[PDB]
Amino acid sequence: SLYKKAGFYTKLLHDGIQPVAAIDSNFASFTYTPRSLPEDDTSMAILSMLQDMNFINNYKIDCPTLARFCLMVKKGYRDPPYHNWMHAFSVSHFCYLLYKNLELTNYLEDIEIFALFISCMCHDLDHRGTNNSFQVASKSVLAALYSSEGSVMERHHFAQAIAILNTHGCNIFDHFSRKDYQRMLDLMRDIILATDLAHHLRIFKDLQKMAEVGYDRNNKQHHRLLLCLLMTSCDLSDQTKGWKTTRKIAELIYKEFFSQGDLEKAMGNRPMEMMDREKAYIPELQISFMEHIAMPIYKLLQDLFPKAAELYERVASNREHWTKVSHKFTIRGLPSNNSLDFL
Ligand SMILES: FC(F)(F)c1ccc(C2(Nc3nc(Cl)nc4[nH]ncc34)CC2)cc1
Ligand SMILES: [Mg+2]
Ligand SMILES: [Zn+2]
């Protein structure tokens, strides 16, 4: 359960902005797997995505500042099995895919799409590999600061994003007017807070009403609801890839969850079944998660955007795969080598 922080640019300045096709001919496709990109090339890819969506020119972002901001964001992640920089990078890449494939400019303002992308990069900053309940039970400093207000980790991720912006030479919004700077801060707050599953459960009925009634580009509340759904779709986007990706990501999620469970047992507390390596049955847990969480999210995206139908079908397909592998996976927890390669 010990996950380190790396700390407390010239290569990026020389040629950090590359045309996206030079990274991969399939870079703008829903079939691209951003986790296949070497970690050392992710900062360059973030700049390339911002350049390709024309945010650098349109918002007059200073490249050296953007380069330092990206490197600070990357250094802001610890190394738990799942909630690390590679997860934030892939979430950010999915946000770029939504922009490239769904024509978001017809549903949201350019500033909202910009905030969505930046929020994707920052959304799990300084994650400790533990959930909100753990912060409360361990009586952590983060729970002392935010438990009374809800979404302990999410409030911390936002606070860490703000601290990066307040670091000298990293303020990418420095030249914005007081009104636009505040709007960026407000959007990032709401978008990051939408990554709390408890928040998604609370607004579901309203998201399912919006899809039923149809999207209204002049309803400010519809813009807020869409941003929440888009953020959760980016957060769970590993579920829209091939079966090898979903299987590997399930292995990382449970390595992280089981370490939290071992830590709660060492504290003399009984963990949730899904966090207990002696009780958890991963195929059944993934089928419930796919059915209750990911599948309804992508079905809502399909209802609002017809081009997103392939995403839902890919998620439904990965859920069907868990049913088929459950015959070959006959143990609780993970095998001794923490790998699901045997499947
Ligand atoms: F809000 C939301 F965006 F929908 C969201 C919902 C769940 C989660 C996490 N929990 C999961 N639990 C299980 Cl069993 N499998 C998983 N696969 N990918 C994620 C995830 C990672 C914390 C994050 C965001
Ligand atoms: Mg999170
Ligand atoms: Zn996340």
Domain ranges in the chain?
1-343
**Amino acid identity for residue 69 in this structure:** F
Q: Which residues contact 50 (CB under 8 A, 6 or more apart)?
A: 56, 61, 66, 117
Ligand 1 neighbours (beta carbon < 6 A): 195, 197, 200, 232, 235-236, 253, 285, 289, 293
Concatenating the DSSP letter of every residue in 109-168 gives -HHHHHHHHHHHHHTTTT--S--HHHHHHTT-HHHHHHTTTS-HHHHHHHHHHHHHHTST
Distances (CA, A) of 98 to 37, 49, 51, 70, 334: 19, 12, 16, 21, 34
* DSSP letter assigned to residue 195: T
CA 5 centroid distance within chain: 19
Q: Whose CA is nearest to atom 3 of ligand 1?
A: 232
* CA–CA gap between residue 260 and residue 280 (Å, rounded): 13
Binding-site positions for Zn(2+) read 87, 123-124, 235
Residue 23, both tokens? 């990274």
**Structure method:** X-ray
Which residue is it, tokens 């941003």?
227
Q: Whose CA is nearest to atom 19 of ligand 1?
A: 236
Distance 124 CA to ligand 3 centre (A): 5
* CA–CA gap between residue 6 and residue 82 (Å, rounded): 16
Q: Return the CA Rg of the chain.
A: 20
Crossing angle for the helix pair 178-193 and 152-165, to the nearest 10 degrees: 150
Phi, psi of 109 (to 5 degrees): -75, 150
Residue 202, both tokens? 């609370």
Q: With residue 277 as reference, give the H or E element that holds it.
A: none
Q: Tell which residue, 281, 255, 286, has the closest CA to residue 129.
A: 255
**Amino acid identity for residue 285 in this structure:** L
Phi, psi of 127 (to 5 degrees): -65, 140
Q: Tell which residue, 292, 287, 318, 314, has the closest CA to residue 302.
A: 314
- What stretches of the chain show up as alpha helix (H) in DSSP? 10-15, 20-23, 42-52, 55-58, 63-75, 85-102, 110-122, 132-137, 141-146, 152-165, 178-193, 197-213, 220-235, 243-266, 282-289, 295-304, 309-325
Residue 62, both tokens? 């200073």
Residue 6, both tokens? 């790396």
* DSSP letter assigned to residue 308: G
CA 70 centroid distance within chain: 16
Q: Whose CA is nearest to atom 8 of ligand 1?
A: 197
CA 296 centroid distance within chain: 17
Q: Whose CA is nearest to atom 16 of ligand 1?
A: 253
* CA–CA gap between residue 69 and residue 188 (Å, rounded): 15
* CA–CA gap between residue 4 and residue 129 (Å, rounded): 11
Q: Tell which residue, 72, 25, 42, 34, has the closest CA to residue 234.
A: 34
Q: Which ligand is nearest to the CA of 133?
A: 1
* CA–CA gap between residue 168 and residue 166 (Å, rounded): 6
Crossing angle for the helix pair 42-52 and 63-75, to the nearest 10 degrees: 130
Q: Which residues contact 288 (CB under 8 A, 6 or more apart)?
A: none
Distance 170 CA to ligand 2 centre (A): 23
* CA–CA gap between residue 117 and residue 184 (Å, rounded): 11
CB 257 within 8 Å of CB 275: yes
Which residue is it, tokens 């769970």?
236
Residue 47, both tokens? 């700049």
Q: Ligand 1, residues 151, 253, 274: which to mutate, most atoms within 8 A of Cβ?
A: 253
Ligand 1 atom with minimal separation from the 196 CA: 1
- Give the CA angle between residues 139, 144, 148 to the nearest 5°: 110
**Amino acid identity for residue 156 in this structure:** H
Distances (CA, A) of 90 to 45, 82, 125, 136, 328: 11, 12, 14, 29, 30
* CA–CA gap between residue 318 and residue 245 (Å, rounded): 10
CB 285 within 8 Å of CB 227: no
* CA–CA gap between residue 115 and residue 132 (Å, rounded): 24
Which residue is it, tokens 């030079």?
22
End-to-end CA distance of the chain: 26
The helix/strand/coil state of 275 is helix
Other residues' Cβ atoms within 10 Å of the Cβ of residue 24: 15
Which residue is it, tokens 């952590």?
140
* CA–CA gap between residue 191 and residue 119 (Å, rounded): 7
* DSSP letter assigned to residue 294: I
CA 198 centroid distance within chain: 15
CA 9 centroid distance within chain: 25
**Amino acid identity for residue 167 in this structure:** T
CATH class name, domain 1-343: mainly alpha
Burial of 134 (0-12, 13-18, 19+ CB in 10 A): buried
This structure's resolution (angstroms)? 1.9
